[PDB]
Amino acid sequence: EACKFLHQERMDVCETHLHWHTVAKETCSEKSTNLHDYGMLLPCGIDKFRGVEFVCCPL
Ligand SMILES: [Cu+2]
Ligand SMILES: [Cu+2]
Ligand SMILES: [Cu+2]
């Protein structure tokens, strides 16, 4: 079925991998979907990034 491709780039923040994975996970849940693949964007340190892209699919 149709899944949704989403990404966030926030130049005003620099956050851990876990933070961004939580953002992706919770965004999909908010939309009544499940997180499939995801990837970190705009690194700002070792294992810190300024964004994330991810895919949400129907439960
Ligand atoms: Cu973009
Ligand atoms: Cu999971
Ligand atoms: Cu997953």
Side-chain angles (χ1 to χ4, degrees), residues 40-58:
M40 297 310 129
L41 296 172
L42 301 178
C44 48
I46 288 187
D47 299 303
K48 277 219 179 180
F49 303 84
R50 293 188 195 298
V52 68
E53 57 179 354
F54 53 107
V55 177
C56 302
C57 300

Side-chain angles (χ1 to χ4, degrees), residues 6-38:
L6 297 171
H7 75 303
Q8 304 184 188
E9 310 178 71
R10 290 290 297 286
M11 304 307 287
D12 54 336
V13 312
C14 175
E15 296 282 353
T16 69
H17 187 297
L18 174 56
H19 172 83
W20 283 116
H21 179 278
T22 297
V23 171
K25 183 193 305 187
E26 304 194 327
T27 298
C28 294
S29 290
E30 180 174 63
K31 299 187 187 303
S32 298
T33 62
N34 293 322
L35 174 60
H36 288 233
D37 195 38
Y38 54 96

